[PDB]
């Protein structure tokens, strides 16, 4: 038996590269607020954990902060996935799956996460699949090109993201492609692809 | 509802400072193996995670490895607490509580865990109290003096523990005292104190 088992409505996950417009897309269901549970912009929690800016620390010193950061991302996603609600529909920005299959994986590849850190995170993900229920009915993939994404990221101008290189976005892009289109990672249940290049 | 809710027998937790003799004490129930579920010496898992020795890495470079290490200690304890069993009695060496109240706390105090890491771990502990069931009926506290503990630690001679100073054991001792005796924190579980100075 898993925590939050049979407590979640139909759930839609909004996925896409950084700056692909996941939040923008979600602001459209804004008026149906009292009929749909909307969990958006999780980044705000990561930028202020009792005063600490984990997102920034991670970008400045990955070798040391990538692990605690991803562990916190995992926790907050899990909290949203299992959050109680009455509404009949639930839509989330991001999910525990993109954190695992795209970000953690990429950080293992670029050396940000030493092997021992990668394994710890992976062991947590395995235990989570077995002890906690993660409702995932539909995934809307806002497909974009790394260049477009890079543009939007810079226009938003989050101080923490000021040093994010285009290669990084290209790596993340391929990883989203592998998971959501080609389905290389155990998921891709029901995916709806949308051209998010405006 | 919590994972593993109403699936656990009467559970006894064996606590005590490093080298207090928790494993030695547990080897005495060894013959009742087929009537009591015995989960001992969790350190072995921490010393070999798919080939990686987290325990060692933590002692050599705390600022960087204390967080992933404690996150893995938490995970394995949680796995033991929720492990399925038919037997009517369950006895464990250590628990998620000593990892939180004694080790994580001490590491926050000596600077091994930056505040951002401490908070991440604490947020996980809070989410765990609400989503997962941790059976705790009795806690046997093997009370010892830091000096005795230091002696046993070095007779055992674990390579990873070769640099553990007496002060460290004194700090851990007080923390065990505060929790299991003075009650300076979260636990309404019955405790049986045993003089473990042989
Ligand atoms: C989900 C996730 C995000 N992040 C980082 C990447 C970004 O700098 C920041 C937020 O990325 P996103 O989760 O993509 O959110 P966003 O608001 O930037 O996206 P959009 O414009 O489509 O609304 O968090 C990680 O480092 N790890 C993770 O596991
Ligand atoms: C539980 C726990 C142990 N440890 C470390 C301290 C030690 O070096 C090692 C094992 O400590 P203990 O958990 O005390 O186990 P032990 O086998 O050393 O004890 P005893 O002799 O009583 O059987 O793990 C942590 O760093 N963090 C933790 O949260
Ligand atoms: Mg967003
Ligand atoms: Mg032992």
Q: What share of chain B is helix, strand, coil (3-state, %, to 5)?
A: 50, 15, 35
The correct answer on CATH 3.40.50.300 for the domain covering A1-198 is yes
Q: Where are the domains of chain B?
A: 1-198
* Resolution value (Å, 1 decimal): 2.4
**Quick check: helix, strand or coil at residue B27?**
helix
Note whether B120 contacts A54, CB cutoff 8 Å. yes
List residues in chain A touching B: CB distance below 8 A. Answer: 1-5, 49-50, 52, 54, 57, 63-65, 67-69, 71-72, 75, 78-79, 82, 115-117, 119-120, 123-124, 127, 131-132
Long-range contacts of A149-157 (CB under 8 A, 24+ apart): A149/A17, A149/A18, A149/A19, A149/A20, A149/A173, A150/A19, A151/A19, A152/A19, A152/A20, A152/A21, A153/A18, A153/A19, A156/A19
Element (H, E) at B11: strand B10-15
CB atoms within 10 A of CB A123: 18
Residues 6 or more apart whose CB falls under 8 angstroms from that of B98 comprise B15, B176, B179
Residue corresponding to tokens 């938490």: B74
Catalytic residue among B93, B129, B151, B177: B93
Q: Which residue of A has its CA nearest to B62?
A: A64
Strand order across the B36-39 sheet: B36-39, B89-93, B10-15, B138-143, B190-195
Distance, CA of B191 to CA of B137 (rounded, Å): 9
Structure solved via: X-ray
The reply to whether A47 sits in an annotated binding site is no
Q: At what angle do helices A115-131 and A62-81 cross, to 10 degrees?
A: 10
Residues of chain B contacting residue A1, judged by C-beta atoms under 8 Å apart:
1, 3-5
Best residue among B27, B43, B62 to mutate for probing ligand 2's pocket (most ligand atoms within 8 Å of CB) is B43
Can you name the residues that pair with B36 across neighbouring β-strands? B89
Single out the residue of B185, B5, B33, B124 nearest to residue A74, CA to CA.
Answer: B124
For residues B95 and B189, is the Cβ–Cβ distance under 8 A?
no
Binding residues of B for substrate: 41, 59, 70, 94, 161
Distance, CA of B84 to CA of B80 (rounded, Å): 9
């Amino acid at each position: 038996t898993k925590y939050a088992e049979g407590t979640q409505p139909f759930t839609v996950l909004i996925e896409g590269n950084i700056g692909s417009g996941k939040t923008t897309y979600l602001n459209h269901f804004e008026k149906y607020k009292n009929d749909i549970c909307l969990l958006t912009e999780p980044v705000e929690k990561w930028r202020n954990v009792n005063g600490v800016n984990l997102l920034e620390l991670m970008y400045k010193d990955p070798k040391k902060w990538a692990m605690p950061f991803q562990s916190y991302v995992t926790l907050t996603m899990l909290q949203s996935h299992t959050a109680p609600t009455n509404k009949k529909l639930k839509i989330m920005e991001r999910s525990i799956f993109s954190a695992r299959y795209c970000f953690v994986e990429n950080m293992r590849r670029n050396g940000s996460l030493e092997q021992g850190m990668y394994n710890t995170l992976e062991e947590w993900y395995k235990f989570i699949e077995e002890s906690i229920h993660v409702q995932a009915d539909l995934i809307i993939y806002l497909r974009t090109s790394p260049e477009v994404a890079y543009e939007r990221i810079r226009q938003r101008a989050r101080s923490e993201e000021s040093c994010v290189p285009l290669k990084y976005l290209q790596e993340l892009h391929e990883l989203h492609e592998d998971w959501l289109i080609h389905q290389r990672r155990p998921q891709s249940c029901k995916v709806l692809v949308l051209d998010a290049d405006l």
